[PDB]
Amino acid sequence: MKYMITSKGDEKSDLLRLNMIAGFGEYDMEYDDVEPEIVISIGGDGTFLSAFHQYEERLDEIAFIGIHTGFYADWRPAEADKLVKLLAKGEYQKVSYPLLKTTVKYGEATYLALNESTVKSSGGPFVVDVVINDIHFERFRGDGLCMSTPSGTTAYNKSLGGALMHPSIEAMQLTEMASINNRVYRTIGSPLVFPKHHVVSLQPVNDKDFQISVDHLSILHRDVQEIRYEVSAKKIHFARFRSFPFWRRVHDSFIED
Amino acid sequence: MKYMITSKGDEKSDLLRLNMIAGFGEYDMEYDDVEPEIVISIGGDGTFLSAFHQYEERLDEIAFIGIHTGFYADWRPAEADKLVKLLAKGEYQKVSYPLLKTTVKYGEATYLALNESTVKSSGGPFVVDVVINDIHFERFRGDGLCMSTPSGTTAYNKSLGGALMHPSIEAMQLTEMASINNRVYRTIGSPLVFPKHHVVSLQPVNDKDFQISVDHLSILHRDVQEIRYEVSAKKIHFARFRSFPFWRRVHDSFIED
Amino acid sequence: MKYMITSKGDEKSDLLRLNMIAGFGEYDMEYDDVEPEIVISIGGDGTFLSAFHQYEERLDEIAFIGIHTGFYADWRPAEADKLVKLLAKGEYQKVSYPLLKTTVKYGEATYLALNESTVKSSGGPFVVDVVINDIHFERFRGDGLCMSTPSGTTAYNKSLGGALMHPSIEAMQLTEMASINNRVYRTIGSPLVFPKHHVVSLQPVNDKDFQISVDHLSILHRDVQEIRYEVSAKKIHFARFRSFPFWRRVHDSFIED
Amino acid sequence: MKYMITSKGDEKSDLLRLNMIAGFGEYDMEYDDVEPEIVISIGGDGTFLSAFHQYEERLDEIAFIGIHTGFYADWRPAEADKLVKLLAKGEYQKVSYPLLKTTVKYGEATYLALNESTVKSSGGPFVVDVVINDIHFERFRGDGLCMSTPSGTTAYNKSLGGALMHPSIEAMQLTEMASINNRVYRTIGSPLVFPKHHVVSLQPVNDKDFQISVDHLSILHRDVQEIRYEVSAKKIHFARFRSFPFWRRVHDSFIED
Ligand SMILES: Nc1ncnc2c1ncn2[C@@H]1O[C@H](CNCCC#Cc2nc3c(N)ncnc3n2[C@@H]2O[C@H](CO)[C@@H](O)[C@H]2O)[C@@H](O)[C@H]1O
Ligand SMILES: Nc1ncnc2c1ncn2[C@@H]1O[C@H](CNCCC#Cc2nc3c(N)ncnc3n2[C@@H]2O[C@H](CO)[C@@H](O)[C@H]2O)[C@@H](O)[C@H]1O
Ligand SMILES: Nc1ncnc2c1ncn2[C@@H]1O[C@H](CNCCC#Cc2nc3c(N)ncnc3n2[C@@H]2O[C@H](CO)[C@@H](O)[C@H]2O)[C@@H](O)[C@H]1O
Ligand SMILES: Nc1ncnc2c1ncn2[C@@H]1O[C@H](CNCCC#Cc2nc3c(N)ncnc3n2[C@@H]2O[C@H](CO)[C@@H](O)[C@H]2O)[C@@H](O)[C@H]1O
């Protein structure tokens, strides 16, 4: 079928990409980086993220495969030829992970996150009111906030004390970054896990400029009126050719491998 | 309909229970603590837990209401007469929360938890292997482990650094109690959120005696071979007469009220 | 004696400053903001920090007093006239708190911190090697690091999970900011408390530009070769007119007041 | 000089102890387990703790050496003969670490801790008032409290989120065990580091029976009126024959070795 391969850019990944394309030339596989049905990422998780955002507008028409040269990449380089044959056969199972939708309104722009989306200030102190489903939950003071996807809970979310979360759970998790808690300032302190259809809105208090990140992209937004977080209706689809449970790759990435 | 009322036992709750029974006598309400269709709890969360476990074998035939004299109790004492009329009218919406199933096998006994279930040792050091869906995830060394329900995430789970979790998410959360992490001993460190159909099994390493708790009940189990945690097929049903969102009562219980 | 008063700049603090100067005019007190022996700060902790850094080169010749209009400010506005008389009498006890010395070398500039000093990157990822007394302790990957004074442990340090620390202990505390811990990346995770004469050196790995903060001042340093942290030989002296223990003001600021 | 050797009891440590005694027989070394001037511990940290408590009443007359068969034990088994010669020469430097004093009053018994001392309840809920230097600081509700020595900060204290602490700092650290924090219950949350001459007193609220631990010893105390924690006037003396900094053995025990 139609496919393309992205590369980390280093010498090891470029030649591995060339060898796979040559192997695909022995099958009925058409290279097409405009409308690929399979997107193969050769590199680290950052390479996989760049591949996801490159084709973030054809998610319901693409299955992703990562090659580790790696949390999202679940294929070793020595298994590259076996992946070529299995991918050429065309018999695989489709696994879908939830995504996070971020909406920024001024006085709007929407983004899509596979890992997480964070909010910080433009230099000054970070103060926002957290509104959950039109209900004011807290006034947050600290460094920032992090809204994570299920697969992203093992990333930035994990470093902030968040809980690890199985991707079969369509939900999002919010965690704090060095929150201020005293006699007057008070936040929940604990990570919050929100289901679908729940909308978390961050509203400015004084400063209206925020440094907002979506995965590896970070932009300084000015004159912000609202940042809306909610579980996206879009999902990322993975092409899986063998059993690799989520808790097993969590074990291999943090326990031992 | 059929109903019963349990009381904290103090003077304030006993007379409040008597006044509600007298008010129910003015309607077509039959008191029956054997097969009640409505179980009213008058007291704290501990009183509500005792009421839940008293009728834990007729959950699919009971709706619970708590009166705060209180996380589960969402009614003030001054609103008691209004609750009598609304309950007498019989028009309310049913809200269901997930529960936790605990299975203990020797060389079996099953329990049901509304808050959480924890495992500790019988005095010696606590060492168990954590097996997730027949896959060995880690070997835990520390004080103990806590498997929490969604509504219980704000209880013992919250004190252990766990994430707060909306009850619409049918799942369970596991957290650590003073885990040992060094060059040789290593655990995930982070809370784990497990969906339905996922089974978490704790298996002994040396000592086989464990102090196991289910909500307020704590028993010393001897010659233990396996402790199995999984989201229960049973659910607790609440009788709700007005909108009281989960994040609002989280706000009222921890932020301000 | 010689003295000066700094103000938060708002209407409440400016007129309070004018009333105290008029009260000092009834005594043998000479106003001198060039060589003051007493520096009175009227405002919040930020106002107190600005006053400290304004006279950070005459610390061994100045005693500080804060008026809360407030962790460092231990005087209420209604007690202003009583403070004028006691300060005019000249009989008070001197209390000294340790300070933090920060040295930045390029390819040097030194700073003095009353609260803490933090290091972040200039946009890219933050990776430094932590060298304790010429011994490589760890390679840190995350958001940043925070080296705090004893009195600053209740500030930014507290939000990062650090321990609260009595100012009689001449030492400094280092805490992590969202550290990365997996199979390959590994840090100590725990706050580190260093005594006097211990030198903690942060050395760059790839990027050499860092956003370094000292209390409220934050500057982007370029071509950095080493950031050295150590307990300063300089100490800040407070003028205390009544018993106000450190744990009592910790209680009043976080427990209840 | 006078000396004795304790053993872990296993086959590896017993024969190693026999070989060292035979090597000591070639020098002017008298074995005496009643009044030894050098106490050699062969085993783990638990073996070292048992050796410390065995001679806890002659600390100012004993230097300790640990052999790892190990945080306190800073000698490898293959270096045993070199230790025999150096110990026989008698030229070594003395390193002293602070200790923790625990006093329990009823309606008194004192203990000495090298690692830490913890308080839990006898089954019921744990509620105590924390009084720092005759000043009520907080009312603690949770699982328990842990008062640690500087060298013990890397032990139980580290698992509870406490800060690591250099032993040159004569002080003690208190940490919480699953503290309850809501709208009504509120604790400091953060670890507390207390200098010398500071007394921390835990006073009962309802239940007066507590399970108190001192290192590996744990006893159920009944009718308790006060538990007093303070830095002990006694210190443990180590016999050091080579440079092994505290942060280096922290690195070797948690980072890599
Ligand atoms: N202070 C901090 N602590 C921790 N992470 C921080 C962080 N600040 C930022 N981030 C992460 O940086 C990413 C920016 N692009 C980096 C590419 C990536 C990635 C990634 N995804 C996952 C995942 N889904 N599950 C588990 N591990 C994952 N990783 C690994 O995290 C490490 C990051 O280099 C590498 O090992 C990665 O393989 C962002 O999306 C934030 O998630
Ligand atoms: N060390 C610790 N820290 C924190 N909790 C611990 C704890 N050790 C034990 N437990 C809890 O004790 C319960 C034993 N019966 C107590 C009755 C109860 C309850 C309860 N349920 C919830 C809930 N679902 N959401 C939010 N708050 C809740 N509460 C409040 O928690 C406080 C407990 O007294 C009271 O305010 C309760 O109202 C157990 O089930 C453990 O959950
Ligand atoms: N993410 C975060 N979380 C927590 N603190 C952060 C933070 N980021 C930055 N900072 C602090 O900001 C200060 C920058 N100038 C603010 C003026 C100040 C102050 C101050 N000193 C102390 C103290 N010594 N003990 C206890 N409370 C203190 N406070 C209070 O902390 C609150 C800060 O507004 C106010 O209540 C202050 O009264 C810096 O020095 C960082 O210490
Ligand atoms: N839940 C928990 N988490 C963590 N520690 C807990 C714990 N509950 C209890 N304890 C510790 O158990 C000790 C009871 N006797 C065990 C013998 C011992 C020891 C010891 N001392 C230190 C030290 N000074 N610095 C760094 N590591 C140390 N170790 C290591 O800690 C591990 C304990 O087996 C072993 O690796 C030991 O080598 C007690 O004193 C509590 O300190």
Description:
4 copies of one chain form a homotetramer. Chain A is of the alpha+beta class. Chain A folds into 2 domains: 1-98 and 234-257, no CATH class; 99-233, Sandwich (Tumour Suppressor Smad4). Chain A is built from 5 helices and 17 strands. In chain A, the strands form 2 sheets. In chain A, strands 1, 2, 3, 4, 5, 6, 8, 9, 14 and 17 form a 10-stranded mixed sheet that branches. In chain A, a hairpin with a 3-residue loop joins β5 (93-105) and β6. In chain A, α1 (11-24) packs parallel to α3 (80-89). The longest helix of chain A has 14 residues, at 11-24. Chain A is elongated, with a radius of gyration of 20 Å. Chain A starts with a strand and ends with a helix. Chains A, B, C, D: It is found in: Cytoplasm. Chains A, B, C, D: The active site is at residue 45. Chains A, B, C, D: GO terms for molecular function: ATP binding; metal ion binding; NAD binding; NAD+ kinase activity.
Rg of chain A (CA only):
20 Å
The main β sheet of chain A shows up as: 10 strands, mixed
Our estimate of the beta-strand percent of chain A is 35-45%
Q: Can you tell me the CATH class of the largest domain in chain A?
A: Mainly Beta
Bound molecules: ligand K2W
Query: What is the CATH homologous superfamily assignment of the largest domain in chain A?
Result: Probable inorganic polyphosphate/atp-NAD kinase, domain 2
Number of helices of chain A: 5
Largest interface: A-B, 35 and 35 residues
Structural class of chain A: alpha+beta
- The tally of beta strands of chain A, per DSSP, is 17
CATH-assigned fold name of the largest domain in chain A: Tumour Suppressor Smad4
Instruction: Label the overall shape of chain A.
Output: elongated
Distance between the termini of chain A: 34 Å
Order of helices and strands of chain A: EHEEHEHEEEEEEHEEEEEEEH
The number of domains of chain A: 2
- The helix fraction of chain A, in percent, is 10-25%
User: Regarding quaternary structure, how should these chains be classified?
Assistant: homotetramer
CATH arch. level architecture of the largest domain in chain A: Sandwich
Keywords (chains A, B, C, D): ATP-binding, Cytoplasm, Kinase, NAD, NADP, Nucleotide-binding, Transferase
Catalytic activity (chains A, B, C, D): NAD(+) + ATP = ADP + NADP(+) + H(+)
Main location (chains A, B, C, D): cytoplasm
Subcellular location (chains A, B, C, D): Cytoplasm
